[PDB]
């Protein structure tokens, strides 16, 4: 009866956008797997923070399904996500089974690369808007967090807490999100 | 001419309170050393995120002085900081040379353990107030970020961005803090 979350961690990911959702989701009682795109080895994030993943993506792939798949941002991280065929397969499968897909900052651009969720309203970092909108396959929003159908997107490192709590509310409900939020000492 | 920051990372530290200041300080051009209290080996944070430190504290100790020493929170992390004689020596030396000391959430309780900065106004997580105030050696503030003399404190994971930007403003000035803040997409 435990919800499961997959966070895909590639070289160049924004470490804040990785750690905040993992931490908050685990506070909400969600079982989170931090999966390394390239294997089990430690991952050097964009600001040189080095994180050890829980598992390789190859192994985590075999322990699904997940109630949410989480794509952090970081320009080089998102580019690595966008080029990986394993990500394509994971995302296409999640879309087909109507599971939640969550991406933040530059992360949503991996959705375009993999032809995921065309027609949805999405947001990105302002600096990633042009890339996301190439072809007009999505409708753009400037909301700090945007959720359309099963696609949940957010704008940047500074929206990471709101992004993570939206995932919690989607998986575990508004009351759990509220309970997890209070000890964090967020402003609003 | 490069400012230097030491972040002391112990088992049980709050990983969000560790990664956010490191990332933001590096965006501000500060040279940050993430130093592991127990050695160079990977550190399991409070929500099971595993971070690889840049160096052992023993080695980082020899490459000072630092313009700021940063104590993350997390209840067990702060307890490990409070029990370490190496932390005592590092903090006492930083106080004597009038360098900045920054602690967040439960981190400030290590200051009391090590008799650092008595008489200053400080804040903590609400749940750590009673511990910090044992003996009446500090004056308590409920401000989200508090700075009195060379002691900079903050309240919780949700204040981590404001805490980190206050460090930047203290070391590099208000204009650099403002430049680093804009791409983060913070609300206020």
UniProtKB/Swiss-Prot annotation, chains A, B:
Changing residue 105 to A: Abolishes enzymatic activity. Abolishes oxidation, association with mitochondria and protease activity. No effect on chaperone activity. Reduces binding to OTUD7B. Induction: By hydrogen peroxide and UV irradiation. In pancreatic islets, expression increases under hyperglycemic conditions. Expression is also induced by sulforaphane, an isothiocyanate obtained from cruciferous vegetables. Sumoylated on Lys-129 by PIAS2 or PIAS4; which is enhanced after ultraviolet irradiation and essential for cell-growth promoting activity and transforming activity. Cys-105 is easily oxidized to sulfinic acid. The modification N6-succinyllysine is found at residue 181. It catalyses: N(omega)-(1-hydroxy-2-oxopropyl)-L-arginyl-[protein] + H2O = lactate + L-arginyl-[protein] + H(+); N(6)-(1-hydroxy-2-oxopropyl)-L-lysyl-[protein] + H2O = lactate + L-lysyl-[protein] + H(+); S-(1-hydroxy-2-oxopropyl)-L-cysteinyl-[protein] + H2O = lactate + L-cysteinyl-[protein] + H(+); N(omega)-(1-hydroxy-2-oxoethyl)-L-arginyl-[protein] + H2O = L-arginyl-[protein] + glycolate + H(+). The active site is at residues 105, 125. Changing residue 45 to A: Reduces protein stability. No effect on oxidation. Reduced localization in lipid rafts. Changing residue 105 to A: Abolishes enzymatic activity. Abolishes oxidation, association with mitochondria and protease activity. No effect on chaperone activity. Reduces binding to OTUD7B. Removes the glycations and restores histone 3. One of its GO terms (molecular function) is glyoxalase (glycolic acid-forming) activity. It holds the Pfam family DJ-1_PfpI. Changing residue 17 to D: Strongly decreases enzymatic activity. A lipid is attached at residues 45, 52, 105 (S-palmitoyl cysteine). The modification Phosphotyrosine is found at residue 66. It is linked to Parkinson disease 7: A neurodegenerative disorder characterized by resting tremor, postural tremor, bradykinesia, muscular rigidity, anxiety and psychotic episodes. PARK7 has onset before 40 years, slow progression and initial good response to levodopa. Some patients may show traits reminiscent of amyotrophic lateral sclerosis-parkinsonism/dementia complex (Guam disease). Homodimer. Binds EFCAB6/DJBP and PIAS2. Part of a ternary complex containing PARK7, EFCAB6/DJBP and AR. Interacts (via N-terminus) with OTUD7B. Interacts with BBS1, HIPK1, CLCF1 and MTERF. Forms a complex with PINK1 and PRKN. Interacts (via C-terminus) with NCF1; the interaction is enhanced by LPS and modulates NCF1 phosphorylation and membrane translocation. Interacts with NENF. This is Parkinson disease protein 7. It comes from Homo sapiens. The gene is PARK7.
């Amino acid at each position: 009866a435990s919800k499961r979350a997959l966070v895909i961690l590639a070289k160049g990911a924004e470490e804040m956008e990785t750690v905040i959702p993992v931490d908050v989701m685990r506070r909400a009682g969600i079982k989170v797997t931090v999966a390394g795109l390239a294997g089990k080895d430690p991952v050097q994030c964009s600001r040189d923070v080095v994180i050890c993943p829980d598992a390789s993506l190859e192994d985590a792939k075999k322990e699904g399904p997940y109630d949410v798949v989480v794509l952090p941002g970081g320009n080089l991280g998102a580019q690595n996500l966008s080029e990986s065929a394993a990500v394509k397969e994971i995302l296409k499968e999640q879309e087909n089974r109507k599971g939640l897909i969550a991406a933040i900052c530059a992360g949503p651009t991996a959705l375009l690369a993999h032809e995921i969720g065309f027609g949805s309203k999405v947001t990105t970092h302002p600096l990633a808007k042009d890339k996301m909108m190439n072809g007009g396959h999505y409708t753009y929003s400037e909301n700090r967090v945007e959720k359309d159908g099963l696609i949940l997107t957010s704008r940047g490192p500074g929206t990471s807490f709101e992004f993570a709590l939206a995932i919690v509310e989607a998986l575990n409900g508004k009351e759990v999100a509220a309970q997890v939020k209070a000890p964090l000492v967020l402003k609003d």
